[PDB]
Amino acid sequence: VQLTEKRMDKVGKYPKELRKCCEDGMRENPMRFSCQRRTRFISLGEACKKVFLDCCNYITELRRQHARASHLGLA
């Protein structure tokens, strides 16, 4: 989808040493965990967690918007 496009550009906005944190935050969520919950045991600093959390909340909203658009036959 064009969400891949929105993700690629989302990752690029961060310093290179924090990009993987953003990528991991935007992975699929089959266990239906909250973004906060998904940070609890990776336990990597204040920087990586914060980036993980932002990108997670970012992609989560995008997924819902895409789901609504698909449901309404707009996308």
UniProtKB/Swiss-Prot annotation:
Organism from which the protein derives: Homo sapiens (Human)
Gene: C3
Name of the molecule in the record: Acylation stimulating protein
Function, in words: Adipogenic hormone that stimulates triglyceride synthesis and glucose transport in adipocytes, regulating fat storage and playing a role in postprandial triglyceride clearance. Appears to stimulate triglyceride synthesis via activation of the PLC, MAPK and AKT signaling pathways. Acts by binding to its receptor, C5AR2, activating G protein-coupled receptor signaling, promoting the phosphorylation, ARRB2-mediated internalization and endocytosis of C5AR2.
Tissue: Produced in adipocytes and released into the plasma during both the fasting and postprandial periods.
Site location ((Microbial infection) Cleavage): 72-73
Domain spans labelled Anaphylatoxin-like: 21-56
Disulfide bonds: 21-48, 22-55, 35-56
